[PDB]
Design brief:
This is part of a larger assembly, with two copies of chain A (63 residues), two copies of chain B (339 residues), three copies of chain C (194 residues) and one copy of chain D (95 residues).
Chain A lengths: L9 H14 L6 H14 L20
Chain B lengths: L2 H22 L4 H4 L13 E4 L7 E6 L5 E6 L3 E6 L4 E7 L5 E6 L5 E6 L4 E5 L8 E6 L8 E3 L5 E5 L7 E3 L20 E2 L5 E4 L5 E6 L7 E4 L5 E6 L5 E6 L3 E6 L4 E7 L7 E6 L5 E6 L4 E5 L4 E6 L6 E6 L6 E5 L4 E4 L1
Antiparallel strand pairs in B: 1-27, 2-3, 3-4, 4-5, 6-7, 7-8, 8-9, 10-11, 11-12, 13-14, 14-15, 15-16, 17-18, 18-19, 19-20, 21-22, 22-23, 23-24, 25-26, 26-27
Chain C lengths: L5 E6 L2 E6 H4 L7 H5 L15 E3 L6 H10 L10 H10 L3 H19 L6 E7 L1 H9 L6 E7 L14 E7 L14 H11 L1
Parallel strand pairs in C: 1-3
Antiparallel strand pairs in C: 1-2, 4-6, 5-6
Helix pairs in contact in C: 4-5
Classes of the chains: A mainly alpha (63), B mainly beta (339), C alpha+beta (194), D mainly alpha (95).
Chain lengths: 63, 339, 194, 95, 194, 339, 63, 194
């Protein structure tokens, strides 16, 4: 064993491995992704009962 | 041997990753914008007091059907609470005590249990028998199960101990895809609405976002310095809030491949034991080791409001699938419905 | 006549008829050397046929059943320990593990006396207890319902009005993978202690 | 098999001696062939000897020696004859 | 030579002379297919004209018992599971049924070790109590009686005065710990759940 | 191919049947003759509430003696009541829970029940011992025992699961004759006072009137829009009232061999879960999936009265064979003796 | 027989039979059947005590 | 078959060598044919020549012992139901009665296996309570006591003081001979029902 080393290195390989396709993934900038999320939330803000007034007939916890 | 070269290569690639993330790093428009949908102070009411637990509640999970909530008490008892009526469908005694997690299946007819034992329990709640019987015991777990989530109704992700969060085939009882690479037990397990990526939080303080089809871990979000208590995907599955044993929650972004933004206060120092998003995902519901919990404005980085109640820590939170309300699985032996 | 395509074994002096291939399902077994036509036999006879197998035919049964269809058989008259001995004679590792589990399941109830019986307590009211007991879990026995004295919400018609304690005997193997908990399990245990 | 998984034991005992004596044999054989043979005959003969060495490695010898042997033969017949087969007495690539 | 109205069959080491009719319990059974000669069969005991097949005769025991007698009774010391394995190899759905019924009977008999045990709750008034315990159904064992407060008619003698709790060792499932579900049953169960 | 030709042939046969019915169809004289004495609104008060149950009541059935009702709760409990004094003649645990049907025999001492067990349980009320020892346990059923009605002391009809409404000899425990032909599950049965013709209402919305004295169907009433919950014959057996999961009751006449007259209802839209006739058959009492039920005129097709006072839906109805009152197998765990 | 759509033609034969008996069975017009039902119901109205007040001892439910 | 003073039956492939005279006890049983060496029953085997009976040797044991020495001994490791079935096969009415008595003794001893089990409730106050608890019958087992609300004072020394639910493991008699009603008994039952 002068080229295998009883496979004690594999863990480090995995580390290296993931880092490679941590780099391969593109970078979407902070502000733009943030804005996308704000648009999604605010569009979904009306359909979120926590963000809207709730009549007793609206919530299944008072009917 | 050659391991030194491999480790140095890992170090330089980590440096490259930091550099690429910092290049991606820009001003967070959410923090910059202080007028985009302010949420204001919100005060919320206990509409259902699911009294009927006398021991602490460790994990509580609603189902996608969003009518029944499975809540596990570490004494070894499951209650499939009917939130709407203040009753239960089943009070299942659990052979193992100290049950950490219970996850309600997407079909709303299976339930999963992971306790201090190395066996994952799959109870088929609904059958022609008219009562609950164990659909499948899953044996062969190396470490102790901490969190689990139904990826299907015939297979499930089971973050056991020993850095294992391997996918498990319910029918055969054999893990099909093995997920290893953390340090210590994989303790947290977040299921995406994408349902294609589960980000596991362990004692490595590293939110490893794994693909649910390949053992290769999609991304390795980092920034947390403590073991990760809870992870909740955004209602898009493109980002997730990560709460660890600190006063700092971290909203990590998959598209940015970096922590989108951080939640922290000097008012709070307890570990963020449970993290969750609203239907919009604009509200971050943070349960704490503090007796009370909180809500942040998720996209304004500030506290939306404080949800004060109980007299003991709240060990888990579950938002009604629709954003109707939240159930607070606490250690004061009550599940409170806040709406 | 010992073998042409079929093999006649003499298991402990008891003649049994099988074929080479049923034994060749697992080609690591001790019977592999015996069945195949080779002069490696240290015990055989061609004066009336049949190789000499000086071993239990009583505990050869379940082992041959596993050798034929990969399934262990646990009889009520079967010493699971004895079939474990025979299985380790015929080197079936999964059968070894399964029979060990059977042995420990039997000991946790019978020879170690009935021990580690799981007990649970369940809060129920009448409307809940009726179907909970009706929907009583599989492998679990009702043990006692008791009516707690109540002044708040009268002493009846209260979600906290009855306590039902149930149980489930563990004829269960203690975990050999590690029944001793790890450090973080004990950390969470002391956290949940109070 | 005596290393119980070990190529280390064979590496210690006999993985190397084959390589070393083969290297010396090819040294002397290549010099003799250069002495006796022209361009094409020498090229095809050393090539045939290389293929026969690989033949021995697969059918007469184990597989564990395949990676070492190619490295030995690459520096014994090719890198040893870098520009001695390019040109010779009215023979070679240029001629 | 090897076949007649009767046929000699070598299950295990021993040879049973049994009619070709008796050996078949359904024309899908492997035994019947072995009754008549097939070009596929190669290994057989041509020494006495008896076909060679490789299975334990101990679990052939209850199988041949049902086949000859028409009723299956599996011994309390022998694995009904071994009988089921014998039946499944021989592909006899009828035997699948009986082994199923016997296994339900055994699970009733083994309803002390974990396997489902039926429990039920009944109401009774003080007056009715003696009747309905006395007229309590045969095959059921009384398990508990609990007094409760009287929401009507003073503190005693109430239509809801005592909860009796009884049980039955036989499980309520159609078979064992798992029965093949039906969708409309789940539909109505959801209907009644809310 | 010619299979489609035979299907066409079936279509044209049904067209001819429709034509013959339409020719048979005339103006409904009863509704136009609404100058009959008004039914008004009957203020209906229960004289005896049967709180002996504490689970929902799914089926219920008065006896031929017309004093004992066999109301079955889906928890596996039969309560052979004393309707005249509110006393429990018998309280029988059931081998399986989720029993949906219970019937009381012409014996007056035999009772039938069917759950998801797929085994029809006939209990002998009276024996030499004095306790309710089971008379027979009829196995052989494939699906769940959707409904059951006693033909004779040793003959019964079990509209089972898997499109089965076979006749069964109680003594042998075997089918007397096989009744089949429905493409949907059979869950409704009706007893004519003839006691020789049972109209089975299956899930395919097909009220097949079968003759018990033959192994083949007699008539096939249609016009339904959903699976048929319950069917009640007239006190003459000349016509039967039918209720499905629709907002209207129906009345099918055998002499007309067509839907004689429908009870349209838009004041209530809940599915007709049970149908019944009064002593005269003039009052048709409809159980509804809402708590309060109704009774309409079978003559003027208008509400004779409202069964009000319930707190949950009523799953079965049974009128006194003397017409003194009607018991309501509600879900509020009380049978209300509406006099 | 599957290739004939699992002998769905048997349903056609049964429907042939159903038409046969439905034609054989006399067809009673809606008006006169309704008249018969009126006669029976009104003739039985007085003995249907649901239509009439019941004294506090006539029924076996106030006894 | 071969002529001998004894006879060798192939009971389930197993050779029972029993004398012909002990089989002449019940001509009304199938055995008395098998003992005929003259052509009244002719049966042979192509290996030994033994007569062939397609009846099990599982429950042939106790029945053959009853034929040999006049008394059945059902081994307490084999189903008494199987012995009853074997008695039915040879339809020996005395043997039927004996095995049914054994099954009744089983059911009385196994009343918690779902078979007959009788229950009652006594009514007493403490003074008589001690007496009749002490003077409880041999066979009747106390199962539960309960208090009932006392309008006198708050507790003891009221006639309505304690119900005493007691039980007894009662024998279940195989049907067809027991629980057969009578007409005047039913008349009186109807009289007393109200």
């Amino acid at each position: 064993m002068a080229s295998n080393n009883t496979a004690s290195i594999a863990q480090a390989r995995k580390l290296v491995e993931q880092l490679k396709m941590e780099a391969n993934i593109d970078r979407i900038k902070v502000s733009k992704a943030a804005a996308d999320l704000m648009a999604y939330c605010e569009a979904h803000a009306k359909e979120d009962p926590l963000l809207t007034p709730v009549p007793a007939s609206e919530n299944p916890f008072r009917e | 041997s050659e391991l030194d070269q491999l480790r140095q290569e890992a170090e330089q690639l980590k440096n490259q990753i930091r550099d690429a993330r910092k290049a991606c790093a820009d001003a967070t428009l959410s923090q910059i914008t202080n007028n985009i949908d302010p949420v204001g102070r919100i005060q919320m009411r206990t509409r259902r007091t699911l009294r009927g637990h006398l021991a602490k509640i460790y994990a509580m999970h609603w189902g996608t059907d969003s009518r029944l909530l499975v809540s596990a008490s570490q004494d070894g008892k499951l209650i499939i609470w009917d939130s709407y009526t203040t009753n239960k469908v089943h009070a299942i005694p659990l052979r193992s005590s100290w049950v950490m997690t219970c996850a309600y299946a997407p079909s709303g007819n299976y339930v999963a249990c992971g306790g201090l034992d190395n066996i994952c329990s799959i109870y088929n709640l609904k059958t022609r028998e008219g009562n609950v019987r164990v659909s499948r015991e899953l044996a062969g777990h190396t470490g102790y199960l901490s969190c689990c989530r139904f990826l299907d109704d015939n297979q499930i992700v089971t973050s056991s101990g020993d850095t294992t969060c391997a996918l498990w085939d319910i029918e055969t009882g054999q893990q099909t895809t093995t997920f290893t690479g953390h340090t210590g037990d994989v303790m947290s397990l977040s299921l995406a609405p994408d349902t294609r990526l589960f980000v596991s939080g362990a004692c490595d303080a590293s939110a490893k976002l794994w693909d649910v089809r390949e053992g290769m871990c999609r991304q390795t979000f980092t920034g947390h310095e403590s073991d990760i208590n809870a992870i909740c995907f955004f209602p898009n599955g493109n980002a997730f809030a990560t709460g660890s044993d600190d006063a700092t929650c971290r909203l990590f972004d998959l598209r940015a491949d970096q922590e989108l933004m951080t939640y922290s206060h000097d008012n709070i120092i307890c570990g963020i034991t449970s993290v969750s998003f609203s239907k919009s995902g604009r509200l971050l519901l943070a349960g704490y080791d503090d007796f009370n919990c909180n809500v942040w404005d998720a996209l304004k980085a500030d506290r939306a409001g404080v949800l004060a109640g109980h007299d003991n820590r709240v060990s888990c939170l579950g938002v009604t699938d629709d954003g109707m309300a939240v159930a607070t699985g606490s250690w004061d032996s009550f599940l409170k419905i806040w709406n | 006549g010992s073998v042409s395509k079929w093999v006649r074994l003499n298991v402990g002096g008891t003649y049994f008829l099988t074929t080479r291939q049923t034994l060749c399902r697992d080609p690591k077994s001790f019977l592999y050397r015996l069945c195949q036509a080779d002069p490696d036999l240290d015990s055989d006879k061609d004066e009336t046929g049949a190789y000499l197998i000086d071993r239990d035919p009583t505990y050869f049964g379940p082992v041959l059943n596993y050798l034929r269809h990969g399934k262990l058989v646990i009889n009520k008259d079967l010493a699971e320990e004895g079939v474990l001995e025979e299985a380790e004679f015929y080197n079936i590792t999964s059968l070894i593990k399964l029979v060990k589990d059977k042995i420990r399941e039997r000991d946790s109830k019978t020879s170690q006396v009935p021990v580690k019986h799981v007990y649970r307590v369940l809060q129920c009211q009448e409307e809940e207890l009726t179907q909970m007991v009706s929907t009583m879990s599989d492998g679990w026995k009702f043990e006692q319902l008791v009516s707690i004295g109540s002044s708040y919400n009268y002493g009846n018609e209260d979600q906290a009005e009855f306590l039902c304690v149930v149980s489930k005997e563990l004829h269960n193997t203690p975990y050999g993978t590690a029944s001793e908990p790890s450090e973080k399990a004990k950390i969470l245990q002391e956290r949940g202690s109070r | 098999i005596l290393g119980l998984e070990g190529r280390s034991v064979y590496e210690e005992d006999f993985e190397a001696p084959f390589l070393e004596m083969s290297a010396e044999f090819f040294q002397m054989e290549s010099q003799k062939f250069l002495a006796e043979n022209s361009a094409s005959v020498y090229i095809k003969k050393v090539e045939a000897r290389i293929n026969e060495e690989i033949e021995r490695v697969m059918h007469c010898l184990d597989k564990s020696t395949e990676e070492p042997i190619v490295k030995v033969v690459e520096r014994e017949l090719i890198s040893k004859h870098m520009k001695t087969i390019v040109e010779m007495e009215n023979s070679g690539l240029v001629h």
